[PDB]
Amino acid sequence: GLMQFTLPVRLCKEIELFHFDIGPFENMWPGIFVYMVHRSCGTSCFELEKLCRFIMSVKKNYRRVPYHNWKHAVTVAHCMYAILQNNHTLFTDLERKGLLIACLCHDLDHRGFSNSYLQKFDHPLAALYSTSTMEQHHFSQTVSILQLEGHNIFSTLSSSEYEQVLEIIRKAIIATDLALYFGNRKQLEEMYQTGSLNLNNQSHRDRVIGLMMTACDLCSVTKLWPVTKLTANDIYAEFWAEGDEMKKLGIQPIPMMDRDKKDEVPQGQLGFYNAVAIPCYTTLTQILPPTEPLLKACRDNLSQWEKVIRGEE
Ligand SMILES: CN(C)CCn1nc(-c2ccccn2)cc1NC(=O)c1nc(C2CC2)ccc1Nc1cncnc1
Ligand SMILES: [Mg+2]
Ligand SMILES: [Zn+2]
């Protein structure tokens, strides 16, 4: 109760900023997460014994893949922390509880392959979950870990608060399926423009929480150029492995996944920032003005990829 987590001064200051990188020391990431839960939620939200045990089980169930790994989980949770801390009064006690945990759990047991590769491989998960294959799996894994003895961090909630938080987490994790993002942002665009957006409407909050989840999930494009550039290598390491596996199934992969087409990456990053990232953080800033720094950083990095094409780097 009277035990705080404290960070070194540089982290204590830099963790509050959207562009914070969690660093290369794996053994500090759990404490970083707890630090963020205590400041975002309270010293009281979770039994520390239970939280710590949950955190290490979740870690254990992320795999040693180049991008969709434990560092990604904590990175995405930190971006949610920054959004929540810059939008204090907009979010309920349960939502701050649910969303940090949703972010930490959102890619549990990711194998480094897209839902498309699972479908074409005919993976058993593709027969169990026809759409949002991995995302339904990640939520399923979150519930399994919560039901490990001594792991139920939500035990102190009423029955109804419990059903609400697991519902917040389920919707939150499903929303990380980028195939659902396009329609979600367009609906939020019309609502904001026509003025029908209403955060007291639960179906509306759901959509807004989903956009936050896309924003946190894509947040590697909102870091300083050197972080963003070096994370790009990790995402492409998976994409190329997935392309290799498509060739093994006798299917020419899209250029994004073809390691024989590295030359097309700068242009592919332009398409990605223009088609996906810039619209995401634009709509998010319109709805949640204090999240503007993510849009600004995303723009700085689009400009960095333009310079790569032009030959200036
Ligand atoms: C959203 N995509 C699935 C389709 C669009 N697209 N097209 C190309 C492309 C097209 C043609 C040629 C080369 N590339 C590449 C992308 N996507 C990403 O780059 C990307 N995707 C994701 C989503 C989880 C999957 C996350 C991060 C990404 N980037 C990144 C950059 N910096 C740091 N961290 C991450
Ligand atoms: Mg995912
Ligand atoms: Zn993710």
Side-chain angles (χ1 to χ4, degrees):
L2 277 188
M3 281 202 214
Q4 286 303 237
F5 286 67
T6 60
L7 297 177
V9 171
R10 187 203 57 92
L11 280 84
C12 178
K13 299 193 189 180
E14 255 97 324
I15 196 171
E16 288 311 310
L17 309 179
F18 285 97
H19 61 263
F20 184 60
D21 178 84
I22 62 180
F25 305 98
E26 296 201 0
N27 294 150
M28 285 178 70
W29 295 340
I32 287 172
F33 182 74
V34 168
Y35 177 86
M36 289 190 299
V37 167
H38 286 172
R39 271 199 110 256
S40 219
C41 196
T43 57
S44 49
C45 278
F46 299 123
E47 224 252 75
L48 196 49
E49 198 181 300
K50 282 184 165 227
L51 181 49
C52 282
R53 197 156 40 238
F54 180 84
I55 286 169
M56 299 313 288
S57 281
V58 174
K59 176 175 161 78
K60 190 202 307 160
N61 281 281
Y62 276 89
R63 291 178 190 264
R64 292 214 196 76
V65 290
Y67 180 82
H68 286 105
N69 58 33
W70 178 233
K71 191 185 194 167
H72 170 70
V74 183
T75 292
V76 166
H78 159 269
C79 189
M80 178 62 73
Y81 166 77
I83 293 177
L84 285 171
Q85 291 290 260
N86 282 263
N87 295 276
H88 185 55
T89 65
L90 276 85
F91 298 102
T92 71
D93 299 34
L94 264 180
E95 291 182 331
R96 286 203 256 84
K97 275 177 196 185
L99 284 179
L100 286 172
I101 295 293
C103 283
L104 195 72
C105 293
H106 84 279
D107 271 331
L108 262 170
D109 192 37
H110 206 288
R111 326 293 170 112
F113 301 109
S114 69
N115 294 335
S116 308
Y117 176 75
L118 284 226
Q119 289 162 21
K120 291 182 182 184
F121 182 79
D122 200 3
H123 192 282
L125 290 169
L128 178 55
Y129 313 120
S130 34
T131 70
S132 300
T133 305
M134 285 305 313
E135 288 85 23
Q136 298 203 61
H137 182 57
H138 304 318
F139 174 66
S140 170
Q141 294 278 280
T142 309
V143 181
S144 300
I145 285 172
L146 267 186
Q147 292 181 168
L148 263 15
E149 277 221 15
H151 286 59
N152 211 300
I153 61 173
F154 296 118
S155 59
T156 85
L157 281 44
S158 62
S159 191
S160 61
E161 283 188 318
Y162 187 86
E163 161 149 58
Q164 280 175 44
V165 84
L166 259 295
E167 201 60 30
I168 286 156
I169 293 161
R170 190 190 61 76
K171 286 171 192 156
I173 291 174
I174 301 303
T176 58
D177 177 359
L178 206 60
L180 300 174
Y181 148 76
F182 302 103
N184 191 50
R185 190 203 55 89
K186 288 156 198 162
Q187 281 296 142
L188 279 170
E189 202 70 356
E190 290 164 31
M191 285 185 198
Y192 171 79
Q193 289 174 348
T194 73
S196 43
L197 188 64
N198 172 29
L199 297 181
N200 298 316
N201 178 344
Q202 184 61 58
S203 83
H204 283 198
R205 278 184 99 71
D206 284 0
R207 289 201 171 282
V208 166
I209 290 166
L211 188 64
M212 287 161 68
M213 291 299 299
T214 309
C216 300
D217 194 29
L218 294 188
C219 84
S220 281
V221 298
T222 71
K223 304 304 179 182
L224 298 181
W225 168 239
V227 175
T228 293
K229 179 184 163 203
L230 290 168
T231 315
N233 286 347
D234 297 327
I235 188 75
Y236 277 96
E238 298 196 2
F239 284 166
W240 295 336
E242 181 170 329
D244 286 354
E245 290 304 321
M246 289 281 197
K247 290 169 199 183
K248 288 182 191 182
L249 287 181
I251 309 170
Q252 258 297 117
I254 69 176
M256 179 189 324
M257 295 182 186
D258 189 350
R259 67 172 74 258
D260 294 335
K261 291 182 181 156
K262 297 191 184 200
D263 41 290
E264 287 174 51
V265 161
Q267 199 65 50
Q269 289 303 294
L270 286 201
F272 176 62
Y273 279 72
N274 286 313
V276 177
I278 296 290
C280 174
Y281 295 119
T282 301
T283 299
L284 181 64
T285 295
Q286 286 174 178
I287 298 167
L288 296 183
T291 74
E292 204 193 337
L294 296 165
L295 173 61
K296 171 194 190 305
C298 181
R299 280 196 178 286
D300 287 333
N301 283 321
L302 172 51
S303 152
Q304 286 305 287
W305 285 107
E306 277 162 350
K307 286 175 184 180
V308 168
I309 295 165
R310 295 202 294 263
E312 298 156 60
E313 42 171 60

